[PDB]
Amino acid sequence: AKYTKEDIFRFADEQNVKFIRLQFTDILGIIKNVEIPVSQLKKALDNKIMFDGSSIEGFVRIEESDMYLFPDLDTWVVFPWTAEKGKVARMICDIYNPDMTPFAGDPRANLKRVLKEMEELGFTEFNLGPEPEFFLFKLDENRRPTLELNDSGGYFDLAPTDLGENCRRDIVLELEEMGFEIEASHHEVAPGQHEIDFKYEDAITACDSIQTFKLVVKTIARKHGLHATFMPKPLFGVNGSGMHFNMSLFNEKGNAFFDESGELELSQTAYHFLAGMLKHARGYTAVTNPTINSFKRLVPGYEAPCYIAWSGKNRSPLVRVPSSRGLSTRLELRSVDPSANPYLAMAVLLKAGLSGIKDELTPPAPVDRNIYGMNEEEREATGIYDLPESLGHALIELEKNEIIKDGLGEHIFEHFIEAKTIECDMFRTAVHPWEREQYLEIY
């Protein structure tokens, strides 16, 4: 109980907020909210706010249903970019049915249910540290994004320098002032691409931090006349954007992935988690990469994980184990992209990893032979397998796998399948300028 009702009332009185955003996330990952005056703060705290519940279902909404908007007190945050005409505050809200039951279609409720399963299994918390990457594009005269980048930087380069602008520095400073924990920020290898690293907190707080980070990055960029994009592959021939998850499992004693007497300073729980992640990776590749453009990033190379393997020496595997040990022991999954929904992503990941622990699966031997060059026979000889190359194959894998369905729940599963199938069908029937430019003259 970080905050209480009286604390929220006192904060609203003493920083004098007049606008409150009760925000939530739908299946597609879009940040949605209802906006109320500060005079209705009491009704929000009393959990009596109605809203059109079909909104969270996305564009496939059919039947309107009124449902509650139970908020969370620990997520009270006041934005500074509010001028003098009243402050603005946001609160992450749970979705509840009118019968005082959490909605099955709420990703946050699904993540809470999966975490409850973890806790009743014997663990305490599921820490996550994400490393999102975003692109910045110069706006046009009509406040429209262009295809030109703000600077021609490089990997870890000091590209934006100083003396005003430097949107990454301003974003980091605003996030720090607002009350977030930032480890480090740098320039990614692609021009105009930046990465900001976060500390390690709980899974739900990790989702809240990710969503708030997306909102803050978009807002600050817009103010500085730029456009912030989290689409994985904005341009061809340019490196994509990733959201690598550094995740660790904790118990009553402490870190469950650390053991000085084990191989690689890893506990058997860590190996079971690795086996569970590797076995079902093809299953949840769709959840971790929910967009068509996401699979354009997953191409064979030296930085895009398109194989199913784990390593700790050669790096660039599907799952990488950082050299740090002790309380910082963790397993990194590099196939996640910023367009993914964090709630569903760690829901399916936790389920897969925990199933690997329940089944006590033995992970395959790590590969440190730089798996990009070996022949197809060599890859087939080892347990190396490729991730799905398109959204349709990933959807088929989702429809085949059953554990990921349980981790996602029913309602979320069918809604995700319907939306993704509609999107794939729309992409399939479209005619692109590539086909015209390479067949109009030839044929």
Added chain:
Amino acid sequence: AKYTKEDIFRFADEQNVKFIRLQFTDILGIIKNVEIPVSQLKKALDNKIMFDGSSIEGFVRIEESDMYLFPDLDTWVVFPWTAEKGKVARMICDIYNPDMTPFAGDPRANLKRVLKEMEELGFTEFNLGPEPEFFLFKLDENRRPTLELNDSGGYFDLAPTDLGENCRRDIVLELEEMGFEIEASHHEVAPGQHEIDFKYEDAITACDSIQTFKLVVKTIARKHGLHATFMPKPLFGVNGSGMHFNMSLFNEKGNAFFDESGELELSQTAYHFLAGMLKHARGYTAVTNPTINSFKRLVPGYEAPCYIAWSGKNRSPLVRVPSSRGLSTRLELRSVDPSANPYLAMAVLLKAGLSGIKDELTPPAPVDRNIYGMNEEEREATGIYDLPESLGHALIELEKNEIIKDGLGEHIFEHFIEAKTIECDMFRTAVHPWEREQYLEIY
């Protein structure tokens, strides 16, 4: 120990810095950094910051490797152009392997190793005073550099005058406020070309000053709506940019290059250093001039050193001995250009000079006959030789010479050659508008 941890913490508290740049330099000389909030200052001081170590390898990075970022306390500098939303500070950081060993590929660690060799040989310090030259170009409407210069000045001319602008004066003032020692500044013979001279400090501090000077010049030129360029030969028919090194060797008694009883008021150590520099000049010409455009500056003339000779009267040799003596006795090398990496440059220079002392080589007799006009037979009769005329020949000379390889280390040597051969091959296969404009109609 100029500063300690507590001093750094007190400074961060009392000038209220909120952004810290842990900056370093790769093989190619590009300034790179990782950016952290002030809340992580403790972790930086604890030498526990990870970063992608393949970044310093340049564009030839293959395998990702995490490695430490051990900072240096004596390089704590706070930038003034930070507005009111928190200050910005930088710290030069050493690159360390995860096993508490300095990385072999770090130029700074290589320079430290060479300096350790010097100290164990019997010397104390290797003072350097550089004289970099830079160009200023007017930006376009889209903040893009143009081919027009800010003013049509001359050699030592009072071209930028006063009443605002005058980017050189502002650069000098900001550098002085920041805590750098500046001897003098003036206008170079080319229009829009300026030179700023530095005092004489240690080699590592000289590198830090050079890198900070480049960063500050670029930032200030950008803020005044100009572009600062350190490319040696921006335009054809216009004098190039040089970074002459005024270097001296010190011992316990004092200056090792000064002797009142010796010829030209020079000690035998100075003559051995001169012989070592002259013998291996063709070897390290590639390191001192690493770009393709650099050798366009090294053309026969009256100001570009393309010969291997030393003098103190006629001036414009490869190596010039200034008339000043005593504690200011020094040897000037005029073949260095601003695009070179200072760490590698003085690493190879110190090695060559010290090898000349170890071998007690006798330098050739100085030439004061204005070596531009004598016939090729006359040049061949004397020990006058030409520097490599292209990057490829310089790379071949590097591959032949072994002492320079030892001075550079292994990892740096193979990475440098690899990247430079890729740059050379890319230049060789390109088709330039010169070929079109002089063959499209003729043939």
